[PDB]
């Protein structure tokens, strides 16, 4: 009976924390071994009274007690374990308090309604009235969970408790109360919320602390979503409207982030009435944070607008502000915009986009900043399907060559991914006139991602423009690229052969590609030496058994002879894959 | 046996390419195998060119993935990462697992040096131990990787000209024979030739001087020049000091400071660099900035 406690005390009082953590983990086994009556009588008071200077053990026991209910004996005896939980609630560390409150949530959920009313509700009033703001913050979260099972009188009592604690002078608890407000309205009724919460809510909004007003706007959107449309205009629109023009930019930043939820909840008519002017006001705020945050939501705000006046408002107010935002010199706002501006390409339509958007998109692309360029070029695809190939291809043709070579490699990759569409649109002649040079230059770019993407794109080009075209133009050069002192380009040739041999038929590969690849097997560089075997593995299925068994087999068996273990392993692997021996 | 194990390792490689750490038993089997594969390399594990030298990583997995995107996939482009790839990163366990997995899969397509941060003491108080405890719960993997960290080589020699080592030179050491005679099966002592090799650095001073790091020393232009003359070396490559261009020359083209962990601690915002030597010892340089997340 007391021997378990005697071992527990010595185990828990030591130097390290690992043994204490193991003791906490084994607490459940100890309790179940001793018995329900033993634990309830002796073990629980000991853990209630013990105080530790270290916090991981506290956190572990906090999370353990939640599962410890079944060992305690089920919901009938959770009143026994409520005292330790409430005593643990009042602590100086926030994470342990968070674990305490979630454990209380679980305990309340499993608690029977009658016992909950009898005991837990008396506990929460004490926890809230505790002089310590830690106690008050731990209390504030229990109101939402405890509301349903209690009677109407208890509901009123806890509602006025919530109002009183929200009326506290210090922000440190008011922020927590405001955060729990949104959840609390989930269980309340329309009459109760409109009667009590909305007034205290406007009081919180009028409060001076931008910190509390940040959670106030969140509770605003939550309660607006909860309530029907016909009543929000009565009370909440003035509050959010005046908050949107608060001196502090933090609340204006938060409401910019949450703007889409507000318009979605209120509905398109309300947005057309009064939200859009406020959104415009955000467009022209000296603070860059709010400007960028609002710019990030333009696509989703627009798409949530009915077609009745969507395009009308877009031309009349949206696009005029968008052009000014683009004209803004700040880097971050412009970069954020560049990602979303392509969002409303299908919304405006073919005519409107080419009329207005394309001049602005071209200006964004022709910008010094790397961030804006890499963002904008990323979303080039979206305009492709709304605007036919030829229009935007001709529009971008002047800037492709300069863009085809620039500092960042991500944009180069973006271009090399989209070029084959331009090649198909503009035909063989123009591509051979200028684009062929760009492709060939890319085939030897410093970075490796480029090289690989360029080879992949060249795969598309050969099949688009015919096998004979490649045999005429591309093969003599790429295949000639297998002689420079560097080995990187001699690897690039092998990748290109691995790719082209797929599309270039068999005769051309046999009389052009094979001879070179086979002659390269003796290269002193081990890397290329085994990557040649890797290429042969892929290319073997495309030959005829005669050519394979004639020339490939000697080279592959020769590769096995050499001394490098890795190339020898690839040689064996390819030999067995092709089943040549 | 070996064949099936190779295919199994391939699955681990591809999985780690997906940021998914292996099981504890897999980690145990990996460390056990890596002991036998690193025992056979002396202190100056010579590596033949070509090569792609990579500086400090500090376990930033997104950065390492972009570095692979830039240089090339490990089976193709040979690499020589230099140390400090376990600390000050939110994915350090994944990074180190990937590095050791590549090393075990390929004996000679890669080689990893030992940085100052790969020891028992430093990792405990700089996150890696905490990361391991949080992820795997216990410390079995921690006592596996810390045990492995001793078997790493100390320096690398590229075609008898380039000398790659994490920290730098040391007043006690003078010649490659001394490095070869040094014993590595020992947690980095707090003072000694092995200690300093992992805490040395350049400076425009001359002579010597106590390092502000509290360990190792700080060498001057003339010291590096004299050491290079002593042993015919033509360029020393180290990576312990954060930089901006990513690669910086010092001591009149004698020591190259490399750093391949862009935006150190997510806030420095520094670019990162990678050096690469072709077959004819034709050095180049590449630069990058971390991939979008």
């Amino acid at each position: 009976s007391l021997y378990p406690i005697a071992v527990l005390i010595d185990e828990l009082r030591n130097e390290d924390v690992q043994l204490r953590l193991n003791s906490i983990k084994k607490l459940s086994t100890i309790a179940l071994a001793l018995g329900v009556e033993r634990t309830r009588s002796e073990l629980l008071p000991f853990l209630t009274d013990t105080i530790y200077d270290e916090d991981e053990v506290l956190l572990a026991l906090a999370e353990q007690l939640g599962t410890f209910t079944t060992l305690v004996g089920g919901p009938e005896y959770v009143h026994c374990l409520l005292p330790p939980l409430e005593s643990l609630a009042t602590v100086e560390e926030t994470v342990v308090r968070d674990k305490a409150v979630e454990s209380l949530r679980a305990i309340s959920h499993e608690h029977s309604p009658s016992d909950l009313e009898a005991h837990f509700v008396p506990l929460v009033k004490r926890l809230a009235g505790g002089d310590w703001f830690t106690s008050r913050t731990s209390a504030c979260g229990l109101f939402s969970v405890c509301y349903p099972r209690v009677s109407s009188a208890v509901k009123a009592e806890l509602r006025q408790y919530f109002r009183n604690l929200c009326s506290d002078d210090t922000p440190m608890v008011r922020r927590a109360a405001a955060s729990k407000l949104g959840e609390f309205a989930k269980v309340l009724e329309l009459d109760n919320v409109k009667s009590e919460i909305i007034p205290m809510f406007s009081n919180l909004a009028s409060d001076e602390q931008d910190s509390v007003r940040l959670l106030a706007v969140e509770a605003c959107v939550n309660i607006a979503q909860l309530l029907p449309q016909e009543d929000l205009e009565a009370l909440v629109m003035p509050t959010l409207r005046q908050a949107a023009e608060d001196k502090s930019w933090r609340v204006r930043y938060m409401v910019a982030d949450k703007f889409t939820e507000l318009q979605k909840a209120v509905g398109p008519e309300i947005t057309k009435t009064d939200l859009v002017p406020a959104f415009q006001n955000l467009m022209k705020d000296c603070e860059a944070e709010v400007r960028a945050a609002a710019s990030h939501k333009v696509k989703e705000f627009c798409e949530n607008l009915s077609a009745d006046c969507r395009e009308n408002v877009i031309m009349s107010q949206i696009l005029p502000c968008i052009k000014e935002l683009v004209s803004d010199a700040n880097q971050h706002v412009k970069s954020a915009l560049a990602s979303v501006i392509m969002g409303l390409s299908p919304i405006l339509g073919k005519d409107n986009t080419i009329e207005h958007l394309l001049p602005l998109f071209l200006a964004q692309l022709k910008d010094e900043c790397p961030e804006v360029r890499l963002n904008i070029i990323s979303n080039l695809d979206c305009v492709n399907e709304v605007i036919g190939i030829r229009q935007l291809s001709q529009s971008l043709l002047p800037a492709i060559v300069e863009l085809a070579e620039d500092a960042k490699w991500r944009v180069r990759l973006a271009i090399i991914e989209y070029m084959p569409l331009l090649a198909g649109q503009l035909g063989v002649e123009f591509f051979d006139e200028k684009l062929n040079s760009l492709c060939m230059a890319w085939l030897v770019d410093h970075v490796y991602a480029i090289r690989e993407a360029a080879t992949s794109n060249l795969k598309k080009l050969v099949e688009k423009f015919g096998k004979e075209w490649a045999h005429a133009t591309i093969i003599p050069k790429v295949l000639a690229m297998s002689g420079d002192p560097n080995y990187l380009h001699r690897m690039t040739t092998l990748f290109c052969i691995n790719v082209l041999s797929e599309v270039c038929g068999q005769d051309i590969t046999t009389k052009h590609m094979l001879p070179t690849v086979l002659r390269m097997a003796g290269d002193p560089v081990a890397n290329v030496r085994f990557n040649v075997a890797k290429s042969l593995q892929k290319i073997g299925p495309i030959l005829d058994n005669s050519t394979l068994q004639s020339e490939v087999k000697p080279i592959l068996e020769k590769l096995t002879q050499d001394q490098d273990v890795d190339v020898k392993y690839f040689a064996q692997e390819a030999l067995t894959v092709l089943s040549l021996a | 046996d070996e064949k099936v194990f190779t295919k199994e390792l391939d699955q681990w490689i591809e999985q780690l390419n997906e940021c998914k750490q292996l099981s504890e038993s897999q980690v145990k089997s990996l460390c056990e195998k890596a002991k036998e594969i690193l025992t056979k390399e002396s202190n100056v594990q010579e590596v033949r060119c070509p090569v792609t030298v990579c500086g400090d990583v500090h376990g930033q997995f997104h950065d390492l993935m972009e570095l692979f995107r830039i240089g090339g996939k490990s089976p193709d482009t040979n690499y020589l990462f230099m140390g400090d790839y376990v600390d000050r990163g939110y994915y350090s366990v994944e990074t180190v697992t990937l590095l050791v997995a590549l090393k075990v899969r390929y004996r000679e397509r890669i080689t990893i040096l030992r940085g100052n941060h790969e020891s028992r003491q430093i990792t405990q108080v700089y996150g890696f131990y905490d990361e391991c405890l949080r992820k795997y719960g216990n410390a079995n993997v921690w006592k596996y990787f810390t045990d492995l960290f001793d078997y790493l080589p100390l320096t690398a020699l590229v075609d008898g000209q380039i000398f790659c080592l994490h920290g730098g030179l040391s007043p006690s050491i003078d010649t490659l024979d001394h490095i070869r005679a040094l014993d590595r099966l020992q947690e980095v002592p707090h003072e000694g030739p092995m200690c300093d090799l992992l805490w040395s650095d350049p400076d425009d001073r001359g002579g010597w001087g106590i390092s502000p790091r509290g360990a190792g020393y700080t060498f001057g232009q003339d010291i590096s020049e004299t050491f290079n003359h002593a042993n015919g070396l033509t360029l020393v490559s180290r990576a312990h000091q954060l930089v901006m261009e990513g690669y910086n020359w010092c001591h009149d083209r004698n020591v190259v400071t490399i750093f391949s962990a862009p935006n150190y601690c997510y806030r420095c915002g520094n670019q990162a660099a990678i050096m690469e030597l072709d077959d004819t010892l034709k050095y180049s340089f590449l630069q990058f900035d971390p991939a979008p997340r």
Binding site: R250, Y253, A288, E289, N330, Q331, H332 | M244, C268, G269, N270
Partner: peptide, 11 residues
């Protein structure tokens, strides 16, 4: 380097 670089990002 940071002082050279602009960074107006604020919560």
């Amino acid at each position: 380097y940071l002082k050279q670089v602009p960074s107006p990002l604020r919560e």
